[PDB]
Design a binder for this molecule. Structure first.
Ligand SMILES: [Zn+2]
Lengths: 941, 20, 176
């Protein structure tokens, strides 16, 4: 081919990966990767630019972000604004894009039988209406306004602004209405001309595309060649920044920051050269592995034993092509905030220990083999994120090593590691403390976020104490990981294998569901367990004691379980309104041992009083910090409280938290473990006799050490959902004391969860999805967060709209109703071919098979918690979905303005439309629930 | 224990219609 | 009818049943005959009462209204009786201490047509909102399974487990 400059030899992939690959480079400089998978249900594609926001003009901050926002609103060949997202929505696809300081990555997925139909327009994106600009400015401004009160954003932009102001690293990457609209209009700047002249940097020599589909590599080749050979090449050099943004006057500095949430954090930063070109060794991943370690003899073990720190993170943080950072961030207790100097001193003592011992080839080899195993048995990723990631990393690595570069280490060089250790010195350190105790003691304000902070010079006396750091006996190198898996044998599929989970055990003690892996065949396993006990959610006191018990358990087992978590065997342990939930996922080789240890700590728990006080104070800080959550999250929380029969508010939990005492908890743990039910789901590379052996092991341990007795069936009480009256409208109103934005959630309730109602609600939500996005966000520009979809809980379902905007919730609500009438007219005037097109799009949406094991076990567990046990739900409900006709009109007239069974409840969080009735304001949730009926429970299978 | 994939605030997907 | 004429059993009761803020009509009969025969006799008695109310004179209807007013406005003879009334109003969490006066004042406003429509809407065999629950208790020896005309009855749903019976049904709200 003349339009292909070169073709890669072969793509180094995993032997377990069945997908085909073919890399090539076109004549215009685009780095193309092709992935053929004849079995995928949805195809995907992604194009990555390497410019980003660090190349923004100094007078227009956020221009690349605004451009990424703008490329979706139509092109020359296709001028309509939402024809792209409407095409993807009508063909069971989605799209998105992000913009990092050195990247601008666009990505999308769609059904496998319209890949070219979508990819043509996606290519038109890279081959500007005034009204669309003036409208999208408000969307960017609502995005930044959404990111104003976010602590990570505040500290991020503050770290950008505390460096050299003349360096592009200090630029504001998001942008807002001032920098995009107000300031350019005041300075006579034509933002549209700036978009056209910027779209001099969008050259083909700095673009990397990745396409994944069912078609053959030759068809994908001819397609990408045809649609991308016409991209003009301008030979734009890749931007580099050899000068580090942090100069001497910015080093050895202390920054006192006041956060929004009541958090206590410590940030240590070391400027380092760009280590990207050292991807074959990854000394930042090595030093991060050693410093951030949590096992015995680590830094976090000492910081925890001294009662100063609870969690520690340390490693390499990416900066740009010319500069990078090496950060160590920790959380602070009330005592650790006063001993920050001692914490940093211990940090430099651990670093000095690493400089004294030197590099460790056995540690490097252990990381190499571990990463090789984790890469070989890596789960099959989702097409959109996979193509986006590969497209993002194509600029850094050759075509043959693009799949294995960030994962496989090959050469061990200690000169680099010793050099970075030479860079980790007190003369090149930056310290930032974040605490509320600095309130009123700050003198500086950040420009973009209004962050209050103070800047001081670190005393040369303290720097000298750091320079004379001796060797600490409490800091030792980690030992050999005893959780490294060595048995990858796939157990043969039993003859009694079932495509869906089967009930192989049903006793009064436990109920065991089991399924042998017959689709992925990977040496992994997911072991889910739910412990039912009425004392878990009987009152806020016992719920707080349960969360404190689980948190103390995980905190005590963190140091021991960090090696298994590093060996690809992780676990999650969280409390639920029905009892505890424990999940152990990963390699089944050494899974039963660690699981046995976790049960042993469940039944032999000894509470430390210091850990109890620290963790209790942390939970108090969490319940206090819920007031700083985002308005839409507060709306979902309030709607949850209103709809659920029994629910304790975080104010009740916070008030009852002070009454929790150590004798009460020590008397509460055996009271909880005295009467239990167990519902398990074992799904992985294990056999039936192995699953029965593990379950019987757990039961025998719980009985032996905890004397656990089964529960009575009459005590299996599930919660009902509040039933709204016909033609009834209720509005609950609260205020957000942190964010200056308003939130709103409208919820219409349906009858119950049956096949017909499920397909009605899902089909209608499929029809109104893209029109909801486009009407409420693209055209009217109400806010940045506009969502609409089905809501299911307690076996009852409904339709929900969730909007975060500046405008008042009553106006937002009236516009929602007017949009409902608009969709009524649209469906009444809709053609049968478009209706059947939504039917097919929803069918492809629902019949999408899971890509990895954890997703399938998550679907099974989702069918277990609901106690419906409908494993064949997709086939039956889609088979009924293809038989529906434009029923939907009667459903809209029955459930959704003058419907005889309209059930509407609105949540308003304070910062032509039809006439709406007078809503009943909710004064008290308890009276609200007492005055209204409750829905029945879904019958079991 | 080690800086992970996009632990900062840089990842700004245009619209959030994939969360919850 | 059920005791003096048909001689079903010694214990024959009927009246209002109030519980948890929800109410209904209740019949309690203990007899030698099987509960299905007893139930057919109760239904035939219900139709007979429909015809009796239809053929009832206005003077006798006002006599029943007045008798119910006398029974409702019966003053308590002792402190434990009055305190029993107040404690009932407190346990029910309705706190309607002036209940008798208002309910009788509204009782003197009802009409025979209101009663007829109420029976035909809530208590008739073909009533659109009939809510019927029957509890049968067999005798000791009964192993496991000129009179008026009884109407045709639908096929009842025999209950196997109470908890399963409750899980599939909604719950009533509380009285404000
Ligand atoms: Zn964006």
């Amino acid at each position: 081919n003349p339009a292909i400059k070169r073709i890669g030899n072969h793509i180094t992939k995993s032997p377990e990966d069945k997908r085909e690959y073919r890399g090539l480079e076109l004549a215009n400089g685009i780095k193309v990767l092709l992935i053929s998978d004849p079995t995928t249900d949805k195809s995907s594609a992604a194009l990555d630019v390497h410019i980003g926001s660090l190349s923004d003009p100094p007078n227009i901050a956020g221009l690349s972000h605004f451009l990424q926002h703008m490329l979706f609103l139509g092109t020359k060949k296709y001028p309509k604004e939402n024809e792209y997202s409407q095409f993807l929505s009508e063909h069971a696809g989605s799209s998105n894009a992000f913009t990092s300081g050195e990247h601008t990555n666009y990505y999308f997925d769609v059904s496998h039988e319209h890949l070219e139909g979508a990819l043509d327009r996606f290519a038109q994106f890279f081959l500007f209406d005034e009204s669309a600009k003036d409208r999208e400015v408000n969307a960017v401004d609502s995005e930044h306004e959404k990111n104003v009160m976010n602590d990570a954003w505040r500290l991020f932009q503050l770290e950008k602004a505390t460096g050299n102001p003349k360096h592009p690293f200090s630029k504001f990457g998001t942008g807002n209405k001032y920098t995009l609209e107000t300031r350019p209009n005041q300075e006579g700047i034509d933002v549209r001309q700036e978009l056209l002249k910027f779209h001099a940097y969008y050259s083909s020599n700095l673009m990397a595309v990745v396409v994944l589909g069912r078609e053959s590599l030759d068809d994908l080749t001819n397609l990408v060649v045809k649609l991308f050979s016409e991209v003009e090449n301008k030979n734009v050099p890749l931007p580099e920044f050899p000068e580090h943004p942090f100069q001497e006057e910015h080093l050895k500095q202390l920054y006192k920051i006041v956060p929004i949430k009541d958090i206590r954090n410590l940030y240590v930063t070391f400027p380092i050269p760009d280590l990207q070109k050292y991807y074959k060794s990854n000394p930042g991943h090595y030093l991060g592995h050693l410093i951030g370690h949590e096992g015995p003899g680590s830094l976090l073990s000492e910081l925890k034993s001294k009662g100063w720190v609870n969690t520690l993170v340390g490693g390499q943080k990416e900066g740009a092509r010319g500069f990078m950072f090496f950060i160590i961030n920790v959380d602070l207790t009330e005592e650790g905030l006063l001993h920050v100097e001692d914490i940093i001193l211990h940090m430099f003592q651990y670093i000095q220990k690493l400089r004294a011992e030197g590099p460790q080839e056995w540690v490097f080899q252990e990381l190499k083999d571990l990463n090789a195993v984790a890469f070989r048995f890596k789960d099959k990723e989702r097409p959109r994120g996979y193509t986006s990631k590969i497209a993002g990393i194509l600029h850094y690595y050759p075509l043959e090593e693009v799949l294995t570069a960030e994962y496989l280490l090959e050469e061990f060089r200690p000169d680099l590691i010793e050099m970075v250790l030479d860079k980790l010195r007190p003369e090149n350190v930056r310290v930032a403390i974040v605490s509320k105790s600095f309130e009123g003691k700050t003198d500086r304000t950040e420009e973009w976020y209004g962050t209050q902070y103070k800047q001081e010079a670190i005393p040369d006396e303290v720097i000298k104490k750091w320079q004379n750091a001796d060797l600490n006996g409490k800091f030792k190198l980690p030992t050999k990981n005893e959780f490294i898996p060595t048995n990858f044998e796939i157990l043969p599929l039993e003859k009694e294998a079932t495509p869906y989970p089967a009930l192989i055990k049903d006793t009064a003690m436990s109920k065991l569901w089991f399924k042998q892996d017959d689709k992925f065949f990977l040496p992994k396993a997911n072991l889910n367990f739910e412990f039912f006990s009425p004392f878990a959610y009987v009152d806020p006191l016992h719920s707080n004691m349960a969360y404190l018990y689980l948190e103390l358990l995980k905190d005590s087992l963190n140091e021991y379980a960090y090696a298994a978590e590093l060996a690809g065997l992780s676990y999650d342990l969280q409390n639920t309104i029905y009892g505890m939930y424990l999940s152990v996922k990963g390699y089944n080789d050494k899974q039963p041992i660690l699981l046995k240890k976790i049960i042993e700590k469940m039944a032999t728990f000894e509470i430390d009083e210091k850990r109890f006080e620290i963790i209790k104070e942390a939970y108090m800080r969490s319940l206090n910090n819920f007031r700083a959550e985002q308005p839409h999250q507060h709306a979902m929380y309030y709607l949850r409280l209103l709809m659920t029969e029994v629910a304790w508010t975080k104010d009740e939990l916070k008030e009852a938290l002070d009454d929790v005492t150590l004798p009460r908890l020590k008397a509460f743990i055996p009271q909880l473990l005295s009467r239990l039910h167990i519902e398990a789901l074992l799904h992985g590379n294990i056999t039936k006799q192995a699953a029965l052996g593990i379950m019987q092991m757990v039961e025998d341990t719980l009985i032996e050490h905890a004397h656990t007795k089964p529960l009575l069936p009459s005590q299996l009480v599930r919660y009902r959902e509040v039933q709204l009256p016909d033609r009834g409208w209720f509005v609950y109103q609260q205020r957000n004391e942190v964010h200056n934005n308003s939130g709103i959630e409208i919820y219409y309730q349906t009858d119950m969860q049956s096949t017909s109602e499920n397909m009605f609600l899902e089909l209608f939500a499929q029809i109104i999805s893209e029109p909801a996005f486009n009407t409420l966000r693209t055209k009217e520009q109400l806010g940045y967060i506009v969502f609409s979809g089905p809501r299911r809980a307690n076996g009852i379902q409904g339709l929900r709209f969730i909007i975060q905007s500046e405008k008042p919730p009553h106006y937002l609500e009236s516009r929602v109703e007017a949009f409902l009438i608009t969709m009524e007219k649209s469906i009444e005037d809709m053609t049968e071919e478009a209706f059947q097109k939504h039917i097919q799009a929803l069918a492809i949406r629902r019949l999408d098979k899971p890509k990895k094991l954890s997703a399938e076990s998550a679907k099974y567990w989702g069918e277990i918690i609901s106690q419906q046990y409908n494993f064949d739900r997709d086939n039956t409900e889609v088979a009924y979905l293809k038989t529906l006709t434009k029923d939907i009109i009667k459903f809209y007239k029955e459930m959704l303005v003058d419907a005889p069974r309209r059930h509407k409840v609105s949540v308003h969080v304070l910062a032509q439309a039809p006439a709406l009735p007078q809503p009943e304001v909710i004064q008290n949730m308890t009276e609200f629930k007492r005055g209204l009926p409750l829905f029945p429970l879904v019958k079991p299978h | 224990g080690i800086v992970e994939q996009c632990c900062t605030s840089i990842c700004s997907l245009y619209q959030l219609e994939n969360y919850c | 009818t059920l005791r003096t004429k048909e001689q079903l059993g010694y214990i024959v009761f009927s009246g209002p049943r109030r519980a948890n803020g929800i109410q209904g009509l209740r019949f309690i009969i203990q007899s030698e005959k099987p509960p299905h025969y007893l139930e057919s006799r109760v239904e035939a008695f219900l139709i007979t009462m429909e015809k009796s109310i239809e053929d009832m004179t206005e003077e006798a209807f006002q006599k029943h209204i007045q008798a119910l007013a006398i029974r409702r406005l019966d003053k308590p003879k002792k402190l434990s009786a009055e305190s029993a009334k107040y404690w009932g109003e407190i346990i029910s969490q309705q706190y309607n201490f002036d209940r008798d006066n208002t309910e009788v004042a509204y009782l003197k406003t009802l009409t025979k047509e209101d009663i007829i429509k109420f029976y035909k809407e809530m208590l008739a065999v073909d009533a659109p909102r009939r809510h019927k629950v029957s509890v049968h208790v067999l005798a000791r020896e009964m192993d496991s399974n000129n009179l008026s005309q009884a109407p045709a009855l639908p096929q009842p749903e025999v209950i196997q487990n109470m908890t399963e019976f409750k899980r599939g049904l909604p719950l009533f709200p509380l009285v404000k």
